Ligand binder design. Structure first.
Ligand SMILES: CC(C)n1nc(-c2ccc3cc(OCc4cccc(Cl)c4)ccc3c2)c2c(N)ncnc21
Length: 261
């Protein structure tokens, strides 16, 4: 028995390959011959309707302009998931690429605000992303950013989650903190020079990334709030959204552009 999200297979045209991997593939395509869409194919060898359908409900229930929207599914294998198309790809490729040159703090804080808005919706609904970071954010026209791909990357993960599996909205706040350094360095790996083992030992004994060049210290404080040892002292996304939305009036009103930020 199938639900309202199902579509017939004839309605999809896959046109350009965009991404690859062990999971499957991602294509840009057309739905019902008239609707630009992203399509994610899954190889028949990989995870079955036992763990597909449990993980489908998440993307079927949650709905917000700052989370990448499900449009349709072909559920019987081979599986196809159809979502909205984000014309600029992942945030990480965006910042690294041709556009990074031109982005400055106002745009970068704005993108942060938007993700914070998406995650504040996840927070209200009592969910947890678990792998929040630039690679899992998509960008569209007019710098619209949307959270994607809800769950090894210990550099983005809060210590309590990486050591004890305590994944909570507060461990997503930590990852947001790291995301802010990706935004403010145009997409560089965090903890540059440090292998994964080095990062746990250091973070656990108090080490935190310093202020990136040309980034205001007030913004690096926000980062340090997200990186508090004690999960419950980290701010909410409601707070973070508000802080970033209001940033240039309330916090940094004499901001003057520089060479990179
Ligand atoms: C960066 C590029 C390859 N890409 N990836 C995507 C993309 C990223 C993650 C996705 C995750 C998806 O969900 C995975 C999944 C897995 C099991 C069950 C369900 Cl319901 C859903 C579906 C489509 C996706 C599509 C994308 C997009 N929507 N628009 C434009 N470009 C996109």
């Amino acid at each position: 028995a199938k639900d309202a999200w199902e579509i017939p297979r004839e309605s999809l045209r896959l046109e350009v390959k965009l991404g690859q991997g062990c999971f499957g593939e991602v294509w840009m395509g057309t739905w019902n011959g008239t609707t630009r869409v992203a399509i994610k194919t899954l190889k028949p060898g990989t995870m079955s309707p036992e763990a597909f359908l449990q993980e489908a409900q998440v993307m079927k229930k949650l709905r917000h302009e700052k989370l990448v929207q499900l449009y349709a599914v072909v559920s019987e294998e081979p599986i196809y998931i159809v979502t909205e198309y984000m014309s600029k790809g992942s945030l990480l490729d965006f910042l690294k690429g041709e556009m990074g040159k031109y982005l400055r703090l106002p745009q970068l804080v704005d993108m942060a605000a938007q993700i914070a808005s998406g995650m504040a919706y996840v927070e209200r609904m009592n969910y947890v992303h678990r792998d929040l970071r630039a690679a899992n954010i998509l960008v569209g026209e007019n710098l619209v950013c949307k959270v994607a791909d809800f769950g090894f990357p210990i550099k983005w993960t809060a210590p309590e989650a990486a050591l004890y599996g305590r994944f909570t909205i507060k461990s997503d706040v930590w990852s947001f903190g790291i995301l802010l350094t990706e935004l403010t360095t145009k997409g560089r790996v965090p903890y540059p020079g440090m292998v994964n083992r080095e990062v746990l030992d250091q973070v656990e004994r108090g080490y935190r990334m310093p202020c990136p060049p040309e980034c205001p210290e007030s913004l690096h404080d926000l980062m340090c709030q997200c990186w508090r040892k004690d999960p419950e002292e980290r701010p909410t996304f409601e707070y973070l959204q508000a802080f970033l939305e209001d940033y240039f009036t309330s916090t940094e009103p004499q901001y003057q552009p520089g060479e990179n930020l």
